[PDB]
Protein: epidermal growth factor
Organism: Mus musculus
Amino acid sequence: NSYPGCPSSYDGYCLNGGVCMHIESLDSYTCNCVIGYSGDRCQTRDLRWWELR
């Protein structure tokens, strides 16, 4: 499952211009981005239609 969360443990898990959201699969934290960026945050500065609507 996935859940919105981002404690103060870190600081700027998302770069370029993304939003932070937590995961419950590995109790890990991740970050979403926009066209021209994705991955664990915004590292994959690529196109790659990875979204809809």
The domain at 1-53 is CATH 2.10.25.10 (Laminin).
